[PDB]
mmCIF file of C-alpha atoms in Angstrom:
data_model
loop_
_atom_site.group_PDB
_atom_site.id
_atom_site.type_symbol
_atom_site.label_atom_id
_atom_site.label_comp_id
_atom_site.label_asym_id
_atom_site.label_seq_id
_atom_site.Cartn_x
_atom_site.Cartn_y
_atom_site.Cartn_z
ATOM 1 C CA UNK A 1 -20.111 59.493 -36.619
ATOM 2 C CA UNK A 2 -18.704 61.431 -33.570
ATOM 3 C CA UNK A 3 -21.432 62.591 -31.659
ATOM 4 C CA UNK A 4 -22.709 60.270 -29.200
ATOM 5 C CA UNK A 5 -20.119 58.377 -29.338
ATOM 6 C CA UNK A 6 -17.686 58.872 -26.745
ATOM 7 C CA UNK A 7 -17.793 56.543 -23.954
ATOM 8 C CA UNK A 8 -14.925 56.648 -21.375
ATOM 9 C CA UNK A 9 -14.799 54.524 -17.918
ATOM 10 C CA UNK A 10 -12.016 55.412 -15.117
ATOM 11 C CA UNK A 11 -11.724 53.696 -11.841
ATOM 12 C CA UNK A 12 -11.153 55.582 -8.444
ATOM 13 C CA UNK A 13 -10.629 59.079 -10.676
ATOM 14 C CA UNK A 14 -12.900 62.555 -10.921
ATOM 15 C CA UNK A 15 -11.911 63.757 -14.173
ATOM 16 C CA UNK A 16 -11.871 67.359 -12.844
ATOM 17 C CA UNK A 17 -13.030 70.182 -15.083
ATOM 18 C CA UNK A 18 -16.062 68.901 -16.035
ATOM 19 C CA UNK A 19 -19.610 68.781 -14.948
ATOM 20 C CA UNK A 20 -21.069 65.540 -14.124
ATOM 21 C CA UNK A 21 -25.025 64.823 -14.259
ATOM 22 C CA UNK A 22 -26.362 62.002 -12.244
ATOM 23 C CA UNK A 23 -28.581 59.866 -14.550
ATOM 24 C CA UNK A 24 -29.192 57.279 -11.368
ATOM 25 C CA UNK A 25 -27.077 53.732 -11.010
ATOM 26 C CA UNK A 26 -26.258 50.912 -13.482
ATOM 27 C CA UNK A 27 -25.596 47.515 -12.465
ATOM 28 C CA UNK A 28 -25.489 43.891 -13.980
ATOM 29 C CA UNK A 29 -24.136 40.488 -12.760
ATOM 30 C CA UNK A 30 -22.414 38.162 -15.177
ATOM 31 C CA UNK A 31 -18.774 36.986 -16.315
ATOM 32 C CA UNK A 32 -15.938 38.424 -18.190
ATOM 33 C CA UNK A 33 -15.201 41.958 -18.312
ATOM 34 C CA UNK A 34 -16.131 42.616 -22.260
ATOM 35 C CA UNK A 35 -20.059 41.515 -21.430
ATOM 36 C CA UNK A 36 -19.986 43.576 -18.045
ATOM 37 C CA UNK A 37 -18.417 46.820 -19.577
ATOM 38 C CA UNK A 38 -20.528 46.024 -22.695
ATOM 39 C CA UNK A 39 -23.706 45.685 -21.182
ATOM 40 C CA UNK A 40 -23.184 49.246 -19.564
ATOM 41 C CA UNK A 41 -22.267 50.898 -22.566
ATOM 42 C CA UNK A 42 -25.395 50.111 -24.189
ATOM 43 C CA UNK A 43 -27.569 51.653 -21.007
ATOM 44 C CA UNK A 44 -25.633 55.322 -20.992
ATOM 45 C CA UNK A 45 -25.345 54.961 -24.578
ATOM 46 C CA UNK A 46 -28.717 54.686 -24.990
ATOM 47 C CA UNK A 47 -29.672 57.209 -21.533
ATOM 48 C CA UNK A 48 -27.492 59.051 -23.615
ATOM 49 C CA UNK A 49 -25.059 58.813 -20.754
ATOM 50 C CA UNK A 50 -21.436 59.769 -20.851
ATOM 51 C CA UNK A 51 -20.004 56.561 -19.224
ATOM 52 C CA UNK A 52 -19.170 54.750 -15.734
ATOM 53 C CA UNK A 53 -17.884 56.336 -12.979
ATOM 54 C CA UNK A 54 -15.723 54.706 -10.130
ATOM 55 C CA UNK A 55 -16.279 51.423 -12.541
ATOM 56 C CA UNK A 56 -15.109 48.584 -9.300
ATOM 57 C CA UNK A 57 -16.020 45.006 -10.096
ATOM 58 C CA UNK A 58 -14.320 43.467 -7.068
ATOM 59 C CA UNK A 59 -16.686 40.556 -6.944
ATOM 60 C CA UNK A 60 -16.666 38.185 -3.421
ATOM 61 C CA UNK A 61 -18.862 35.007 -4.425
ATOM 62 C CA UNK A 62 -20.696 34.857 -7.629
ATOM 63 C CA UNK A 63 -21.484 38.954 -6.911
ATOM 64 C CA UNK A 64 -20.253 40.445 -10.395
ATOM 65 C CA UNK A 65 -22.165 43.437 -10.227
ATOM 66 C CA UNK A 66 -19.974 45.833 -11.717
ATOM 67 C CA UNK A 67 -21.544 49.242 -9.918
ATOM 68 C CA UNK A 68 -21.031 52.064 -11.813
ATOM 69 C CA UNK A 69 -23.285 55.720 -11.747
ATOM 70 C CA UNK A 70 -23.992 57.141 -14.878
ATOM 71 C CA UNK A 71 -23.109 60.532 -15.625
ATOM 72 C CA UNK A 72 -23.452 63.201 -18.219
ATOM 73 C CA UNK A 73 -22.386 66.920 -18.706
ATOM 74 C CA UNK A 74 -23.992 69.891 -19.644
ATOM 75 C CA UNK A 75 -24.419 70.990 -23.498
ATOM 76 C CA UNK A 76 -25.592 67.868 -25.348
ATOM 77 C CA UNK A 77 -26.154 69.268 -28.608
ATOM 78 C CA UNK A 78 -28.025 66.222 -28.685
ATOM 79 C CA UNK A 79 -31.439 67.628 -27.708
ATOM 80 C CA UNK A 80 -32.552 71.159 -26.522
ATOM 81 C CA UNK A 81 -35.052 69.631 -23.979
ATOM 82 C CA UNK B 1 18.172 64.631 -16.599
ATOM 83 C CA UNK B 2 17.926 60.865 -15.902
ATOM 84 C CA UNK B 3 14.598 60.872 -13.789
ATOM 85 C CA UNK B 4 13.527 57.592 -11.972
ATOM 86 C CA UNK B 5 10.080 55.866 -11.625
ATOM 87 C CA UNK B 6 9.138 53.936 -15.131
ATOM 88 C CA UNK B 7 6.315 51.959 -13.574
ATOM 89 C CA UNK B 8 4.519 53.641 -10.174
ATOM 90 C CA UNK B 9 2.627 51.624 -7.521
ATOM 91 C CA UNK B 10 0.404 54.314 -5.334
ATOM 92 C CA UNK B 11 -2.373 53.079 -2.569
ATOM 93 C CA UNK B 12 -4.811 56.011 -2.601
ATOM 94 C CA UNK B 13 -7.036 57.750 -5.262
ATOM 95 C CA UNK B 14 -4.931 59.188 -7.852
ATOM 96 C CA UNK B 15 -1.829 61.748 -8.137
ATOM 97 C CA UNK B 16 -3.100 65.436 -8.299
ATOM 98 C CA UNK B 17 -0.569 67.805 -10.509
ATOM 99 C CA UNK B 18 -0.822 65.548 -13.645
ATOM 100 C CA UNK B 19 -3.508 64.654 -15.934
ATOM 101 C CA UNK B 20 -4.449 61.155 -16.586
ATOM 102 C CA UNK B 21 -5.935 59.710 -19.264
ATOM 103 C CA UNK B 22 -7.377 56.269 -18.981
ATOM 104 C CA UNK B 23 -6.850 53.835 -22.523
ATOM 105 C CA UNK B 24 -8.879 50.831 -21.016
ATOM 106 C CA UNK B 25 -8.961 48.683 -17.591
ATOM 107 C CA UNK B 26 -7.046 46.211 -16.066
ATOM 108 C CA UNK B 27 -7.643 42.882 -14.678
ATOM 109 C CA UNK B 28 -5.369 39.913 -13.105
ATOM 110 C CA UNK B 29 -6.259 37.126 -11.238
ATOM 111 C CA UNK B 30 -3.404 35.425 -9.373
ATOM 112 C CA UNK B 31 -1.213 34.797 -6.018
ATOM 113 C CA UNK B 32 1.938 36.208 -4.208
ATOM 114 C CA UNK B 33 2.816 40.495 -5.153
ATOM 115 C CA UNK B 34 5.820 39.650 -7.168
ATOM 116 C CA UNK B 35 3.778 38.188 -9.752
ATOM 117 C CA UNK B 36 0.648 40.393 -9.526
ATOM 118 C CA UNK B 37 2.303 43.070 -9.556
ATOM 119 C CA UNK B 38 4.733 42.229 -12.774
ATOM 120 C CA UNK B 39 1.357 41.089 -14.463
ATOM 121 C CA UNK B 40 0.316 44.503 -14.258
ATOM 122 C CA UNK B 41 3.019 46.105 -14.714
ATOM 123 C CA UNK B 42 3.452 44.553 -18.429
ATOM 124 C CA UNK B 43 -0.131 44.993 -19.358
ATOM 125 C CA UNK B 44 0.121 48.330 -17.999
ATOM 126 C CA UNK B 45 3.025 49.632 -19.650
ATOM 127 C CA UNK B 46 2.454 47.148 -23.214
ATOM 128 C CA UNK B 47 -0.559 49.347 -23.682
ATOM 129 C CA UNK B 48 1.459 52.166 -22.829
ATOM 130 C CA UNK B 49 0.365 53.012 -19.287
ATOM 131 C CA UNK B 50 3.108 54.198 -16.932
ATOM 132 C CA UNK B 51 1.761 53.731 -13.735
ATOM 133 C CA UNK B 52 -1.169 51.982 -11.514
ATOM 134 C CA UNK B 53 -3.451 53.451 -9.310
ATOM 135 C CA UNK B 54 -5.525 52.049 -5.917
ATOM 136 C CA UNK B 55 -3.093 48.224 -5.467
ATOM 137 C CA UNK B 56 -5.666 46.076 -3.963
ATOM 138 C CA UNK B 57 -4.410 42.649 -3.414
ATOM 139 C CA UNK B 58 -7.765 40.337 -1.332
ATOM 140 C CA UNK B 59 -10.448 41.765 0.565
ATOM 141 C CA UNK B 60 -13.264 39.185 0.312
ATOM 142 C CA UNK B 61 -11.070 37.082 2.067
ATOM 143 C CA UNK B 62 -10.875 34.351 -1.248
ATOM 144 C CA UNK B 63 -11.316 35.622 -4.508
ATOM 145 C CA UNK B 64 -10.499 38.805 -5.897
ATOM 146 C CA UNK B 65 -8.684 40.365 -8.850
ATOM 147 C CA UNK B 66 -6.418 43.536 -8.284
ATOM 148 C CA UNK B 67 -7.693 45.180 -10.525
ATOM 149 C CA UNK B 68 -6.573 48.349 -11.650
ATOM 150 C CA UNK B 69 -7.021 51.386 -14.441
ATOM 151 C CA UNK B 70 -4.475 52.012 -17.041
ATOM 152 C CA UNK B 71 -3.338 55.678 -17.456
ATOM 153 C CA UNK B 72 -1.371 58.478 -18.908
ATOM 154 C CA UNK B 73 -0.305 61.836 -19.242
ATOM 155 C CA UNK B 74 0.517 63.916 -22.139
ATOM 156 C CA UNK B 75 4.042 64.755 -22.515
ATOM 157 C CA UNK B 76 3.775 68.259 -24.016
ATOM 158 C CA UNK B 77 2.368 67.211 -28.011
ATOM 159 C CA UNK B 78 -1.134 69.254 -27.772
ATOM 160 C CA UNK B 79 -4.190 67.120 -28.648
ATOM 161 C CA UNK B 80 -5.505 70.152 -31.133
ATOM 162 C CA UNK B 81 -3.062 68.951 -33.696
ATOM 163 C CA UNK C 1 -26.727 76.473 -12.907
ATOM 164 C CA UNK C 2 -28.724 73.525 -11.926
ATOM 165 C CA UNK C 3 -29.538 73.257 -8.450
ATOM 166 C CA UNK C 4 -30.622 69.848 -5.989
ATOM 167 C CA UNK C 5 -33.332 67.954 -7.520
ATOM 168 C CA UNK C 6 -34.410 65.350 -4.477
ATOM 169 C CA UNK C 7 -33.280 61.796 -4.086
ATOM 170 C CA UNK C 8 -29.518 61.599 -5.630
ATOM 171 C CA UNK C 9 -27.538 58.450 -4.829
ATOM 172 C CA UNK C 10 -23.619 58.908 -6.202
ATOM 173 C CA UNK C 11 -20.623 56.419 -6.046
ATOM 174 C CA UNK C 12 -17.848 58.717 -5.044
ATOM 175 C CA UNK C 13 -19.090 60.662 -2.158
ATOM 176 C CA UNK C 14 -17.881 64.014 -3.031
ATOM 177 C CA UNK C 15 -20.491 66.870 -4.792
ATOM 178 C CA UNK C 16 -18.522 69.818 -4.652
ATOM 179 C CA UNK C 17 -20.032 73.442 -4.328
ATOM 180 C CA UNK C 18 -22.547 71.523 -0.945
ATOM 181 C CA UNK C 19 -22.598 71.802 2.237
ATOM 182 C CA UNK C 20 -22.718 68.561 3.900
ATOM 183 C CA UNK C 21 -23.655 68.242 7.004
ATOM 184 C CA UNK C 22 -23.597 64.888 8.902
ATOM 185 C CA UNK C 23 -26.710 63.176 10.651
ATOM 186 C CA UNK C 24 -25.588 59.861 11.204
ATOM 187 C CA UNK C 25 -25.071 56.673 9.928
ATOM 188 C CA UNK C 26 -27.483 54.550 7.856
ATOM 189 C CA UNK C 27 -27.191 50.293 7.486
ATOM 190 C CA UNK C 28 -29.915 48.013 5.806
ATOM 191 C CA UNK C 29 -29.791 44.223 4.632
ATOM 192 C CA UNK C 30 -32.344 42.594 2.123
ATOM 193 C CA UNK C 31 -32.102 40.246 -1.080
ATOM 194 C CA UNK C 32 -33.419 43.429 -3.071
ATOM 195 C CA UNK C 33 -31.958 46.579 -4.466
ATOM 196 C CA UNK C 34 -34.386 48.151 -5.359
ATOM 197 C CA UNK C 35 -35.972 47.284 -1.725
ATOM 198 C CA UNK C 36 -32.880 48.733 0.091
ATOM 199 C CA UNK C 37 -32.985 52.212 -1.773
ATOM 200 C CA UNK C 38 -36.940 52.417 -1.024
ATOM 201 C CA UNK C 39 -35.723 51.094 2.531
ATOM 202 C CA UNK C 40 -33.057 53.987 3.114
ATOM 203 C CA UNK C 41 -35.378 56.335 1.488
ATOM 204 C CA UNK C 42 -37.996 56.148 4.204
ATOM 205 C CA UNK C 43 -34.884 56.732 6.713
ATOM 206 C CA UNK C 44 -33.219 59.063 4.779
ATOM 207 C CA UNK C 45 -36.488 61.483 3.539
ATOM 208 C CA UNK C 46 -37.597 60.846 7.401
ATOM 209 C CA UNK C 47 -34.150 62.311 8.082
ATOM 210 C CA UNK C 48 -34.530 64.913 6.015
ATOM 211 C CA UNK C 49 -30.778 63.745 4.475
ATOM 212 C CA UNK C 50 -29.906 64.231 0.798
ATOM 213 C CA UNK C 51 -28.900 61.390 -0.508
ATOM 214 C CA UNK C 52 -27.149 57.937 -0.356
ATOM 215 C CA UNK C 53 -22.838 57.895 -1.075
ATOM 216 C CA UNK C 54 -21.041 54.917 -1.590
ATOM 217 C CA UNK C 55 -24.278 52.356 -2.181
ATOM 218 C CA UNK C 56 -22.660 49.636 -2.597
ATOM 219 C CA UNK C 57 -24.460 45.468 -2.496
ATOM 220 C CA UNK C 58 -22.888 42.182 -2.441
ATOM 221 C CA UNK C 59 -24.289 39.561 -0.061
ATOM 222 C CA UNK C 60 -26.619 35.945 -0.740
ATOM 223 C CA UNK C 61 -27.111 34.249 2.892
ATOM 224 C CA UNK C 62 -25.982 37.197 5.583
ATOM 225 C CA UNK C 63 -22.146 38.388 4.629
ATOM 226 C CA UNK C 64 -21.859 41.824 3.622
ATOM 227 C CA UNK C 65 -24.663 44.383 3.324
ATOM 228 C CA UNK C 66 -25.640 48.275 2.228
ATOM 229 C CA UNK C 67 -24.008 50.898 4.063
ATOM 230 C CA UNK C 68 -23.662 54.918 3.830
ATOM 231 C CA UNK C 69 -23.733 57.765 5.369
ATOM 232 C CA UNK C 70 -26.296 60.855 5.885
ATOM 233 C CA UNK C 71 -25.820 64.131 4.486
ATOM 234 C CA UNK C 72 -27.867 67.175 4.237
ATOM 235 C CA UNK C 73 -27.058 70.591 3.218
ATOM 236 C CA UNK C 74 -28.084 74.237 4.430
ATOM 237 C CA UNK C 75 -29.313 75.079 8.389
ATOM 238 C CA UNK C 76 -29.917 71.554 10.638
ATOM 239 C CA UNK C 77 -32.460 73.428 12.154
ATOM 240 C CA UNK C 78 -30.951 72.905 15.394
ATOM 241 C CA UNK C 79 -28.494 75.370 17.218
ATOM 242 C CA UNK C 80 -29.345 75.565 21.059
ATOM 243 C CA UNK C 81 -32.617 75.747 21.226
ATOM 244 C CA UNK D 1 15.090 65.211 19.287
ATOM 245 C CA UNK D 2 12.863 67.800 18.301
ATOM 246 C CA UNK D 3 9.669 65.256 17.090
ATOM 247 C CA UNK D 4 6.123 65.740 16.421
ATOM 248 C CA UNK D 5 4.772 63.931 13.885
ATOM 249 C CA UNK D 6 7.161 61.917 11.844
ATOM 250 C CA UNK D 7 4.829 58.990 12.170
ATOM 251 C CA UNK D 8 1.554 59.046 10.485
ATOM 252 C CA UNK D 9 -0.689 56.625 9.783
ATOM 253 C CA UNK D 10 -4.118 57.484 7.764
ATOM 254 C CA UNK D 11 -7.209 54.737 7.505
ATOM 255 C CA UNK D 12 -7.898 54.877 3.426
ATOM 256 C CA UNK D 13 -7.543 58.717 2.631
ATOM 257 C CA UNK D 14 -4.474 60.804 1.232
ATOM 258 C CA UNK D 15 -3.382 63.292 3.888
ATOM 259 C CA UNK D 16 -2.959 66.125 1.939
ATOM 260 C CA UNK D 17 -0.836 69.150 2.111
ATOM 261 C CA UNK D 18 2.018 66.943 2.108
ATOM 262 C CA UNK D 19 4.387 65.686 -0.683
ATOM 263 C CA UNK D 20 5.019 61.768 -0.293
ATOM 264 C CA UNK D 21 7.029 60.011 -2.337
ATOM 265 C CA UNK D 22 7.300 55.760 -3.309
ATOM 266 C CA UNK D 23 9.895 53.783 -2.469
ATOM 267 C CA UNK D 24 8.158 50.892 -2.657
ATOM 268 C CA UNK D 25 5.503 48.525 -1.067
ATOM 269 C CA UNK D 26 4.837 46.837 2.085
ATOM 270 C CA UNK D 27 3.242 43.906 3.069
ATOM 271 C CA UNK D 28 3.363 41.535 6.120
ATOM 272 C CA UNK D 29 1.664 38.137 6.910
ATOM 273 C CA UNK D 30 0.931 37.516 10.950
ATOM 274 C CA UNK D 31 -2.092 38.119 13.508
ATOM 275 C CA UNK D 32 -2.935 41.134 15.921
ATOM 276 C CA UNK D 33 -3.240 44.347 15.160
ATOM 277 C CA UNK D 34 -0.578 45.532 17.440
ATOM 278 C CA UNK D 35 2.032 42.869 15.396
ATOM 279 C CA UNK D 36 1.375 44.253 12.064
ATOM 280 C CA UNK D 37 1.367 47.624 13.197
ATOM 281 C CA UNK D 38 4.649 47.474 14.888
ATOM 282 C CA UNK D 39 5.917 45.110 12.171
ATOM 283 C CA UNK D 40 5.257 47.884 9.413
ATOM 284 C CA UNK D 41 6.686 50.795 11.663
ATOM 285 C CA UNK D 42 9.949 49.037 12.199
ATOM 286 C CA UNK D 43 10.053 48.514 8.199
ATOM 287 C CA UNK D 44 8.906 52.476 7.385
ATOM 288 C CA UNK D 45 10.911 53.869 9.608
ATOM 289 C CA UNK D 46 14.170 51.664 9.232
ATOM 290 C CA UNK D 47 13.875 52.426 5.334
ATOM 291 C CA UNK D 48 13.551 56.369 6.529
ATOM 292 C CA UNK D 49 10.182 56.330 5.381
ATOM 293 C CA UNK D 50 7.322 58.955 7.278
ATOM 294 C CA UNK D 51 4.623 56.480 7.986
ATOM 295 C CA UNK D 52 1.823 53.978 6.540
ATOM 296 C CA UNK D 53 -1.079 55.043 3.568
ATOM 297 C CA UNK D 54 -4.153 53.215 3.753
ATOM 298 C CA UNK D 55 -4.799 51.218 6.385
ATOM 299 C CA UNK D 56 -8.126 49.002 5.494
ATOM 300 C CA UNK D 57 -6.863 45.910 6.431
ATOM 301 C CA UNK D 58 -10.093 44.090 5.650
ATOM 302 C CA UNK D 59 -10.946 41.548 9.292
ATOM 303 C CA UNK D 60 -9.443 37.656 10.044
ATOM 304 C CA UNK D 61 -10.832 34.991 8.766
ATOM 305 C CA UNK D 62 -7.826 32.208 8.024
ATOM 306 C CA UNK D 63 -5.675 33.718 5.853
ATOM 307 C CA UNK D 64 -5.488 37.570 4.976
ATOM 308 C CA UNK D 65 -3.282 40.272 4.523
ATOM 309 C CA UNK D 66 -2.366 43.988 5.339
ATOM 310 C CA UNK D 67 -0.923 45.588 2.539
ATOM 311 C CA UNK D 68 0.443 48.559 2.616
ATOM 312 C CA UNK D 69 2.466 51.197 0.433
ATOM 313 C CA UNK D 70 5.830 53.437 2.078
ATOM 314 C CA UNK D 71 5.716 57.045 1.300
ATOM 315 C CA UNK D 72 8.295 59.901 2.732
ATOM 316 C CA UNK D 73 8.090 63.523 1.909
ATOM 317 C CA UNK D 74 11.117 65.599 2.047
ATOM 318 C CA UNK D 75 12.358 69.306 0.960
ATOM 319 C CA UNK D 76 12.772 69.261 -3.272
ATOM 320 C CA UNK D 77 13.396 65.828 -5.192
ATOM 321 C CA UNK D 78 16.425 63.566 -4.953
ATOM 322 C CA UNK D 79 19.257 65.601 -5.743
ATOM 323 C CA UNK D 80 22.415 63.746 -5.648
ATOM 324 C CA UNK D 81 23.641 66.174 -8.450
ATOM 325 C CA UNK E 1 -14.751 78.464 20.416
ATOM 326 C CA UNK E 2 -16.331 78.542 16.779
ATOM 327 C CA UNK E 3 -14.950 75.234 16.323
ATOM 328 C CA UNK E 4 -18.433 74.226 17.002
ATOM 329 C CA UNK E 5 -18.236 70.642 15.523
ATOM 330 C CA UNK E 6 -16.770 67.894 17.439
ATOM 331 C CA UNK E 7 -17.403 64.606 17.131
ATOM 332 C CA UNK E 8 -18.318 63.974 13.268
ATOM 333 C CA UNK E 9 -18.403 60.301 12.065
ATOM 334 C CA UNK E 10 -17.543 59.793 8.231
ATOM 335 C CA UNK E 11 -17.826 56.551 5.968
ATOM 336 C CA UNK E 12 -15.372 56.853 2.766
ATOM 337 C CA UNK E 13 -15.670 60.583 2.614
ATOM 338 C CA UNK E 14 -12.710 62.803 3.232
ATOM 339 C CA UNK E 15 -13.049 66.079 5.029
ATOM 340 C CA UNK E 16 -11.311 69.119 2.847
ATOM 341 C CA UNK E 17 -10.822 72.533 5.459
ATOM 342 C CA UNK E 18 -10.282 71.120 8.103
ATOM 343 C CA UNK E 19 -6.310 70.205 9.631
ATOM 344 C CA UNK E 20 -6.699 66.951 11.080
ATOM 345 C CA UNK E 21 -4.283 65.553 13.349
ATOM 346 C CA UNK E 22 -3.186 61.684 13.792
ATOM 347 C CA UNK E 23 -3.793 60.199 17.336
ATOM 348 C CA UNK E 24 -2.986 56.644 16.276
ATOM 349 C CA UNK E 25 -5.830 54.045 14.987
ATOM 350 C CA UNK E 26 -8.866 52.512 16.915
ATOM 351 C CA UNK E 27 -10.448 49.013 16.627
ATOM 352 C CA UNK E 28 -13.082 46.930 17.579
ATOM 353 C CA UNK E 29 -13.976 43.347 16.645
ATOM 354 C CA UNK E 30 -17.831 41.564 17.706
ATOM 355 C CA UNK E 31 -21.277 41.882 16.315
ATOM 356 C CA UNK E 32 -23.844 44.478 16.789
ATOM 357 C CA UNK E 33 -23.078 48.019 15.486
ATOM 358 C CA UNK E 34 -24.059 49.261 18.520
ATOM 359 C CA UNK E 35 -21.617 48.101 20.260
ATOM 360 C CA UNK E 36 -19.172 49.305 17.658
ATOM 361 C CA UNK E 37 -19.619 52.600 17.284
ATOM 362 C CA UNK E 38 -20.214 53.050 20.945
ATOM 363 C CA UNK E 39 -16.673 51.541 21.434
ATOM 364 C CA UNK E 40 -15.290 53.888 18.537
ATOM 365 C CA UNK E 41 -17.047 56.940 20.433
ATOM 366 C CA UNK E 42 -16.181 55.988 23.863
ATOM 367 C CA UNK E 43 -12.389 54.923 22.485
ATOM 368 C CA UNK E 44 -12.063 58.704 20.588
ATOM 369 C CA UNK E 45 -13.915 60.593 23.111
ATOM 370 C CA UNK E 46 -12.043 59.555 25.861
ATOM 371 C CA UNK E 47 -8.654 60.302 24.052
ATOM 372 C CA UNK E 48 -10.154 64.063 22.920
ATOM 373 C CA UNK E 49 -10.418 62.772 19.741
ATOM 374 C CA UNK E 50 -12.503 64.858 16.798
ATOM 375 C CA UNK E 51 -13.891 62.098 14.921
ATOM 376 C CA UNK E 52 -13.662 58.859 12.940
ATOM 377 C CA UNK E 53 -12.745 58.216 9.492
ATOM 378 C CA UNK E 54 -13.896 54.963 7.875
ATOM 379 C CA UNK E 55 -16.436 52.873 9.553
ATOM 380 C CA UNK E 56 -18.421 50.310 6.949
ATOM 381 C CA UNK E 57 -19.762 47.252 8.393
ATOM 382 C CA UNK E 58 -19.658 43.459 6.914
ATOM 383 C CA UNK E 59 -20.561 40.615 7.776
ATOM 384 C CA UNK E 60 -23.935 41.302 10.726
ATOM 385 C CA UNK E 61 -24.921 38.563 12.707
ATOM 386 C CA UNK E 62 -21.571 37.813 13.483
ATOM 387 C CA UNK E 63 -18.205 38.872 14.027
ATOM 388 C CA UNK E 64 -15.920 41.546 11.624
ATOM 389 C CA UNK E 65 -13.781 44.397 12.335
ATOM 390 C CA UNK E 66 -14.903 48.130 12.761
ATOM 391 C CA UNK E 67 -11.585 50.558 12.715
ATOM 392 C CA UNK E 68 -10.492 53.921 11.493
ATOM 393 C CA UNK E 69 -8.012 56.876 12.248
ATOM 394 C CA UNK E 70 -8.622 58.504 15.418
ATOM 395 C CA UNK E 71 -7.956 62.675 14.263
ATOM 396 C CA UNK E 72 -8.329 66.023 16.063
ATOM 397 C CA UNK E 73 -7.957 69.230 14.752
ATOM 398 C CA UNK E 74 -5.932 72.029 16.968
ATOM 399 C CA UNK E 75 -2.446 72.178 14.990
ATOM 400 C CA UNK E 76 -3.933 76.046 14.176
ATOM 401 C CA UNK E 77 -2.076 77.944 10.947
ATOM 402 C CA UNK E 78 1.237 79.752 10.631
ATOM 403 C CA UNK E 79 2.952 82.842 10.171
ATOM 404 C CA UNK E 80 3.564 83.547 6.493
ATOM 405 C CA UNK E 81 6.923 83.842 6.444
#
């Protein structure tokens, strides 16, 4: 229970010093943050992602399509590939 | 000695020169700074944040939440032990 | 070190370690995602770009739309000549 | 006397090779760009501020706002030792 | 004369390397991005400008507001003294 495991979401940051991977884009509309943030989890959790990147919801009308890239670094230990 | 800041309101990115760790996100829905801006400020600092990054107010032109990160930096206690 | 793959779409426009070079400015409007990136692609591979920065959606009748701008890295093939 | 820049005004970006300090935030209701401009000048530079961060200002529609945040950069910290 | 580059056009994407210089702020209001950017250009141009920063469109078929810092670089180095 600690591999795999670490999800982290920032907003309008670059967490310098380490490598991000792109893994391609997430998106999903619905309310409250909990079901947004925990509907993303479960897609780079189970990409194997690392979490959300520049994580803005600023919705306009209905439009709650939290866009968010998923991104993962080097040395997975997870698989060799 | 006695610095000065407590809670810090920035329009921009983030503040190079100190690291910042993020402990969850934000959210407040409301009218006029004074109050947006204290609503944040004690969520912020209750979970122990000590400043706010990127202070959107309305952009859509109706609705829309500030919404902002909550971060931190490490006084000098090394996360190793 | 892992080089360019081919189509990569990021929210932060930044890549470090690239060249970017600028060839304009892309715009598209649809009721489709997935219809917009194939849309940009055919501008953006017919460009010979890099990618899309900043994709960002959010629009039912005709309000806002997708936006970015071209990149592409190395010579532009173009000099005088 | 002696003045070249003292007055700068960046469109959403962080000017950087320069130290700016908070001493608060701005914000001004009225129409016309050239109002709000000069409105927020008169207010930096009567608080001895050095100009305006982030400029988005998002368009009119019936009731919006241009917020902004006053920065000044100066030799060392506050002294007053 | 290696300056080269002249008139660049960037949407949320700073430029690192180069020293830009603030020649006040630019903008346009109507439909069309045509018309836009060719008031943008013609508006920079004319003033010797280097380029625009920000850009983004909302809102086609109809009216918004297309803006940005108007920057040119020519402030050169300095001595290290």
């Amino acid at each position: 229970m600690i591999f795999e495991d670490k999800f982290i979401i920032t907003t309008a940051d670059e967490i310098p010093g380490l490598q991000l991977y792109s893994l391609g884009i997430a998106s999903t509309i619905s309310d409250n943050v909990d079901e947004i943030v925990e509907n993303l989890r479960k897609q780079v959790k189970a990409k194997g992602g690392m979490g959300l990147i520049a994580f803005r919801i600023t919705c306009a009308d209905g439009k709650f399509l939290g866009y968010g890239t998923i991104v993962k670094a080097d040395e997975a230990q997870f698989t060799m590939a």
